[model samples]
Target: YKLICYYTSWSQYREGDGSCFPDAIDPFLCTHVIYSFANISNNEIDTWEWNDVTLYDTLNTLKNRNPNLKTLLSVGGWNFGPQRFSKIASKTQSRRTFIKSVPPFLRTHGFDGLDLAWLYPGRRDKRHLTTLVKEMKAEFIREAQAGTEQLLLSAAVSAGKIAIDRGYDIAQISRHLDFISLLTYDFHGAWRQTVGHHSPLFRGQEDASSRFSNADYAVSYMLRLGAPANKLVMGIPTFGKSFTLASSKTDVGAPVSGPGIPGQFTKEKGILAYYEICDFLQGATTHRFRDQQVPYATKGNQWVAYDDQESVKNKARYLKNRQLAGAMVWALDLDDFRGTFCGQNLTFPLTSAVKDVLARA
Candidate 1:
């Protein structure tokens, strides 16, 4: 399938409501939907909740909705527990425990397979990942061989410098995984002061590596790292990041002028969902940045990055050119129910457009 759709259950909203699903994803699109699983640690799995939705109910609901969809339950996100993964990886027994427990946990939740999203696996001990990923794959293979229904194995990895070092021992890790999800976004952000780029094509004069942001460097790097292009899934962000202006306002390069203080994904002002941001943009926001191809606001000094149809199209091109296995978005609920971005609704338009680009290739 050329197109892939993912729905991360928003943690602070109502549960058991398919109301979030838009009509745009009609009958013959959206072949896969992967849900995000957060906070996988010892004893925390039983109690953790994203909104009122239980992990199990969500899996079952999304899974049964479309039998054609290859639904996957993703574990270990940015804030996942290192100790837990260490615990799971260190001992053979613990590994066996997880291997046995994870599938049933998924089956009970109604997921078709599991997607591992352990951020910065190589940041710690390189061998930890080797043990973790290899054993995990062995378990998956064992399950697949036992007539226990096929469970797909996929992993989400950074497409930047960190991944190149020792993320998973590319060759060894690739052999085990059915496919790998490339996190192509988050290449740049507010962390870098001086009104730089969030997700830019080229870095400015000051920052030499800036010209080569996530898209240029990371995407191709994974392909070169021995990951087959077909098995590599490019990750596109449904949301955006914001930054403040450091110098005088100038549209020199789609210059976005705003207050000096950034206000996204922070303690004071939180991140807004894509649907919410789009509605805000439609009502009274202005566009910012050339490459982002997005709209934003500057009340005091904050900028926002939310996906529009055009931006989505550009990302689709990036993935298709690489001949990626498919494309996966962060969540399903972020898009406008009426196909706000690119005149296409959430799941179908995004997925279909990806396929269209793939066909061109």
Candidate 2:
């Protein structure tokens, strides 16, 4: 089992004095630390600036503290959009160009692997996407034969039906990659008129929105579609979705105006980090929604749906029982990175719970 966590580059600029630097990461907590992003421009990997190279150096040195830890540079994110990936992956020449650049770039920065995080490839891009992976794998084999250190290849995939149908060739993808990280969160949020769980463990009778609105649904569907269980890593969020109630009702189907107020530190409307949620839970009316198998809290018109240590424990146990490869966190920075918040007052509590449970597995 591999415990993976993404470390966002932008997190260093988090509001106020809450910045998270590469040096602050607890390397022992994760088997793999994926640097949030390196841009894919002109079919090549591009760094933000000279400082990014320094940051990469700083990140790789964590292996000195824990020899077992490995790092990977993630390319493309939601902000990077899908056009570049579409263009680069669509042709043999472009794919070859990208593939040829991967080894030296990763080697230069002391990274052990690369993670493809193209938000998604369209349905029409299914074949092109597979070709890209195949070409990369072929290059990896060539490097191995020449006595270069073994390199890793992996991707972050969507859990939505649209992505499942149009974005991947499951069997082929599973064969070529070390593992696939399934983004099982964000089932429902401010974009919906009805309230829903952002990451539910189970779908209860109360869930009318969609049968695919829970983590269980996503995992089952993927495995059913031939995605190897051992190659699938379930992704869990360290943040919550906040919504403004249309009325006083705050149940699952209640109407909503839009996103709730932003958090003090995260500074993102409709999203609250685990730390901020922990602070807000203090004076809020909390409830454990039996059907969804998760807990939520409400204060005035603000309702926050997030994973607590207990909820994360349950998810870890589920992943263990399901015999999945392991679990991955959307980001470690969003968790109480400083350990300054929360009643238990533990740093990386959610990830700690995941690691502890996965150890038993």
The candidate maximizing TM-score is 2
Query: Model 2 lDDT vs. the true structure?
Result: 0.88
Question: Mind giving the per-residue lDDT tens digits that candidate 1 earns over 46-151?
Answer: 2245452454454455434566657677777755775666666667776666667776666666677888777775556567777777887777677777687878
Q: Model 2, range 21-96, lDDT digits (tens) per residue?
A: 8898898999999998898667788896447998999999999999899999999988887887898888888888
With a 3 Å backbone cut-off (N, CA, C), the pairs that clash in candidate 2 are: 123-166
| Model 2 misplaced regions, further than 4 Å | none
Prediction-by-prediction clash tally: 9, 1
lDDT of each: 0.58, 0.88
Worst 10 residues of 2 by lDDT: 204-213
